[PDB]
Paper text:
The transcription of key genes prpC and prpD in MCC is activated by MtPrpR, a member of a family of prokaryotic transcription factors whose structures and modes of action have not been clearly defined. We show that MtPrpR has a novel overall structure and directly binds to CoA or short-chain acyl-CoA derivatives to form a homotetramer that covers the binding cavity and locks CoA tightly inside the protein. The regulation of this process involves a [4Fe4S] cluster located close to the CoA-binding cavity on a neighboring chain.
We then truncated a large portion of the C-terminal region (residues 441–486) containing the 447C-X2-C-X4-C455 iron-sulfur cluster-binding motif. In addition, residues 81–154, which were not visible in the MtPrpR81–486 structure due to flexibility, were also removed from the expression construct. The resultant prpR155–440 expression construct produced soluble protein with no color and the protein was a monomer in solution as shown by SEC. However, CoA was also absent in the structure, even though 1 mM CoA was incubated with the protein during crystallization. The iron-free structure revealed a dramatic conformational change of the protein. The loop between β7 and β8 of the GAF-like domain flipped back nearly 180 degrees to be oriented towards the CoA-binding cavity and blocked the cavity entrance. A hydrophobic fragment of the loop with the amino acid sequence of 402GLGYLGP408 inserted into the cavity, interacting with Phe240, Phe336, Phe412, Trp232, His319 and Val414, all within van der Waals distances to the loop. Gly404, Tyr405 and Leu406 at the tip of the loop occupy the space where the 3′-phosphoadenosine diphosphate moiety of CoA resided in the CoA-bound form of the protein.
Residue numbers in the entry: 153 to 354, 363 to 435
The structure:
Amino acid sequence: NAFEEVRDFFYDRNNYIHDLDMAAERMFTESGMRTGGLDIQLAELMRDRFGISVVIDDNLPDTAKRRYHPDTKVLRVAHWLMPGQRAFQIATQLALVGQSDLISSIVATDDQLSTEARGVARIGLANYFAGAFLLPYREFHRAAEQLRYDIDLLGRRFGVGFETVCHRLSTLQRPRQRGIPFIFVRTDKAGNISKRQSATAFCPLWVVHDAFAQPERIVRQVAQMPDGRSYFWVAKTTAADGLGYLGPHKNFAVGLGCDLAHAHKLVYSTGVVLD
Ligand SMILES: [Ca+2]
Ligand SMILES: [Ca+2]
Ligand SMILES: [Cl-]
Ligand SMILES: [Cl-]
Ligand code: NA
Ligand code: NA
């Protein structure tokens, strides 16, 4: 299972890829980027630095979110995407073309990966870079602390979707500047579940599946995990639209869980309990 190999690859690295995370943040800062309208700014960077022309287009083959034309250096980006997802696509291609050697060197540190897993890892690392470019580490970490980890306000502040914020929160393991350690859980209506752990090594799946009963509303609960500790969980369905990295082909629920001992920093931790 290639996806299982890549899950271990990120697990072994605490879900944080330092060289790519730092490369994204340095490129964001050195190019004078500012949060807001990053899709236009990235298009300028792509032209200036690589001679790649970004164009917004419809009728992309297979309703893809992007199509790169390497022979004339044109990146087509789907018109139905919101600015945050347009930026995400462009930054993903920026990693593939401008961080290719770095990505290859990172993948190579896992001696066991199969070929299929190396290809999955390459795309995952380019996606990782895109998240770390749209949400540069120190700025995003500072914003998460000052907004008390409010996923919706973070999304509105940076112009990105709910699962994009959640995934980034689950990567904040930079040494000496960690965020709250989260378990990230994504599931579809049929129970197909992707779980990512930062601190643990393990499950009450209703902590995220419960979101499907109150669509587009945050669902919060406290549940014990297999270690005997209680976790505070926040979950929501993702709208099938132009924002967030999850495909609009079906509906997902996404959630974060943190040790109850970290939950006081969450805006979510005030409220009344019931069965
Ligand atoms: Ca391992
Ligand atoms: Ca969405
Ligand atoms: Cl992709
Ligand atoms: Cl997004
Ligand atoms: Na290194
Ligand atoms: Na870990």
